[PDB]
Design a protein around this ligand. Structure first.
Ligand SMILES: O=S(=O)(O)CCNCc1cccc(F)c1
Length: 658
């Protein structure tokens, strides 16, 4: 079906455009599709792009509108006072504003389907909502519609929700076009998706992106594949990876680097209403916060992530217990058996499960995958699936058996309910990953483990040294390996905060000189410096010229390979805002070789100051472009939970930044 109306190049300059004559008598039947290509790089706080209204006295609540907010939220209202219907459907963080300083053409498709009683909205090729109702209201079946309007809604003869922007193309159809037909509509996106809803991970949500450029030129990305909405652990989360061999143009189907099987990998539409949005998968083990590095010596890729046993997050993790027991020099994972009230077992050498009460070995062993064997025979547990069919979250057995893992709720032997760090390696640059190993405790038997800083580890250019930053109360705890990650030692660096989420990322300014940038609770990004390849660390300083919120946001950083303005250059990625996670910037700093101080000379705004930007990953692509994979939404805001396809990838050149 071809359009019943088609128009274009409308400038919305705080003055509505009447298209009633052109459109109203074209609308027929109960199903409609609106296709609109529009720009708004300077939107008003709340504005309507398109309206169908009853403009008469006493019918101010009889209208259909497509509206947007300066937060990037998109939505519709469908209202009829006589029918007593006031529908409002929307999703935050659905829009782009600007890319490389030019207004982005957003492609909006809204489908109003009378047969399925469903309203569906897509923006930039992403389905942002699909709502089914019991009582369907066709958009031109509103009582007394007499105006079709661009850039406002006409209510009682006056202009409401006046817009600033432009509509380059608008088409309407007297049909609810299919999901297939929608897929064929040309897009003008400034971004790409690496991970996305419906891909091989089957997670509907993603958080905590990473990027790392490998020596072969392959670019590797890791991420939290988050199943139970966007909630941190406790939840179900796996670590997924994807790579690009063509400088970020295309990406491989994801595989898992770290995954648990105690709960099904389910693509679930997590509820966003206030009563249910804090529903949380409460009995699954999870991985969270990955970080990547490449080792030149072995050629291996190394990935670490936090590990959380069933039902555990940072909120309830046993502080005061590492989960290991010291036996004269060595660290052994503790285990609690079904029915015991204490942890009377340890995993000794060769995975042998050992009874600490009688110093006796058992017939149980723990394999490489942390699965429980009895006499060489693999034990199993029944898997769980989750659903909201009952009206609340239900977690229940699904009839499938999976290998029994000591991180599981249903396991015969269970680890201490605290946080761990695991490592996995790849010998094929991310085509497959090994079974993970737990790192040993670094701060003692009675200290819970540190938290990995997501993003990149650091491979010093002039040596074999590998470093992963981690954080805990009162310090950064750098984990250092000189033997391809086979053994690790810690290097502790005091910071003047208690309990900070001090997510830290490192750059090598020059041989042996490391600057670490980190999240604080002060509203400023901090930094410290090592001049001996991470053995010792300076006191903490703060960057002026960038603002973060009181709670802070992860910051990513790289040392650029090429000189800028004749100087060594560092690039920082972070929100720049004291209010929320928004106003994303890449900030280019030039190093003063007199004292290694940095002058933050260029600020590149990734999109509008009001549009969301949270955790991020940055890398120098082999062609010297800059790749950025980032949460394009406010991942703190309690209004922006459980959004799909907001972690997005862009390609930039240094001349775009400067
Ligand atoms: O600042 S945010 O709230 O967006 C993310 C912080 N997540 C920290 C964390 C890290 C490891 C395990 C957890 F349960 C939680």
């Amino acid at each position: 079906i071809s359009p019943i109306f088609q128009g274009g190049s409308y400038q919305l300059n705080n003055k509505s455009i009447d298209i009633s004559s052109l459109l109203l008598d074209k609308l027929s039947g109960e199903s409609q599709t609106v296709v609109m290509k529009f720009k708004a790089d300077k939107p008003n706080s709340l504005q309507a792009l398109f309206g169908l209204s009853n403009s008469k006295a006493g019918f101010k609540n009889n209208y259909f509108s497509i509206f947007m907010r300066d937060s990037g939220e998109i939505g519709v209202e469908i209202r009829d006072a006589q029918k007593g219907i006031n529908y409002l459907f929307s999703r935050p963080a659905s829009l782009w504003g600007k890319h490389k300083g030019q207004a982005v053409e957003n492609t909006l498709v809204f489908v109003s389907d009378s047969k399925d009683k469903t309203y569906t909205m897509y923006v930039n090729g992403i389905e942002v909502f699909s709502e089914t109702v019991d009582t369907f209201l066709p958009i031109s079946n509103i009582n007394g519609i007499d105006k079709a309007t661009l850039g406002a809604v006409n209510r009682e003869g006056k202009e409401h929700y006046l817009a600033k922007g432009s509509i380059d193309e608008i088409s309407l159809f007297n049909k609810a076009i299919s999901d297939q037909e929608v897929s064929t509509i040309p897009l003008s996106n400034p971004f790409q998706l690496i991970f996305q809803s419906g891909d091989s991970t089957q997670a509907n949500y993603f958080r905590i992106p990473t990027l790392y450029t490998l020596s072969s030129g392959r670019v590797l990305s890791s991420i939290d594949a988050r199943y139970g909405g966007t909630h941190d652990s406790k939840s179900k989360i796996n670590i997924a990876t994807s790579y690009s061999d063509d400088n970020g143009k295309t990406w491989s189907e994801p595989i898992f680097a770290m995954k648990f099987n105690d709960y099904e990998e389910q693509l679930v539409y997590w509820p966003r209403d206030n009563k249910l949005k804090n529903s949380q998968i409460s009995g699954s083990a999870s991985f969270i916060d990955s970080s990547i590095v490449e080792d030149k010596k072995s050629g291996k890729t190394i990935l670490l992530a936090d590990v959380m046993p069933a039902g555990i997050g940072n909120n309830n993790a046993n502080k005061a217990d590492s989960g290991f027991k010291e036996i004269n020099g060595h660290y052994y994972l503790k285990l609690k058996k079904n029915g015991d009230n204490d942890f009377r077992y340890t995993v000794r050498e060769n995975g042998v499960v050992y009874n600490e009460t009688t110093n006796k070995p058992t017939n149980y062993t723990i394999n490489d995958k942390y699965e429980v064997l009895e006499g060489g025979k693999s034990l199993t547990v029944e898997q769980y699936s989750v659903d909201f069919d009952s009206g609340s979250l239900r977690e229940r057995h699904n009839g499938k058996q999976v290998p029994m893992n000591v991180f599981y709720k249903d396991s015969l032997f269970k680890v201490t309910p605290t946080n761990y760090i695991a490592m996995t390696t790849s010998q094929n640059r991310g085509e497959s990953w090994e079974q993970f190993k737990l790192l040993p405790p670094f701060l003692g038997e009675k200290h819970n483990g540190t938290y990995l800083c997501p993003g990149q580890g650091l491979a010093l250019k002039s040596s074999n040294r590998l470093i992963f930053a981690t954080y805990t109360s009162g310090e950064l705890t750098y984990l250092i390996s000189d033997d391809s990650g086979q053994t690790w030692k810690k290097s502790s660096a005091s910071i003047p905060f208690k309990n900070a989420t001090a997510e830290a990322q490192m750059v090598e300014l020059r041989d042996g000189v490391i600057r670490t940038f980190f999240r604080t609770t002060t509203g400023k990004i901090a930094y410290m410096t090592s001049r001996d390849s991470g053995e010792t660390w300076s006191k903490v300083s703060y960057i002026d010229g960038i603002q973060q919120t009181s709670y802070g946001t992860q910051v990513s950083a790289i040392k650029y390979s090429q000189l800028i303005d004749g100087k060594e250059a560092v690039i920082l990625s972070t929100p720049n805002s004291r209010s929320g996670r928004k106003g994303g910037q890449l900030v280019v700093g030039l190093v003063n070789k007199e004292d290694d101080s940095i002058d933050w000379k260029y600020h590149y705004d990734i999109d509008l100051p009001s549009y969301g930007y949270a955790y991020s990953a940055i890398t120098e692509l082999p062609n010297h472009h800059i790749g950025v994979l980032f949460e394009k939404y406010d991942s703190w805001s309690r209004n922006e939970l459980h959004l799909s396809n907001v972690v997005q990838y862009i390609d930039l050149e240094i001349n775009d930044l400067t």
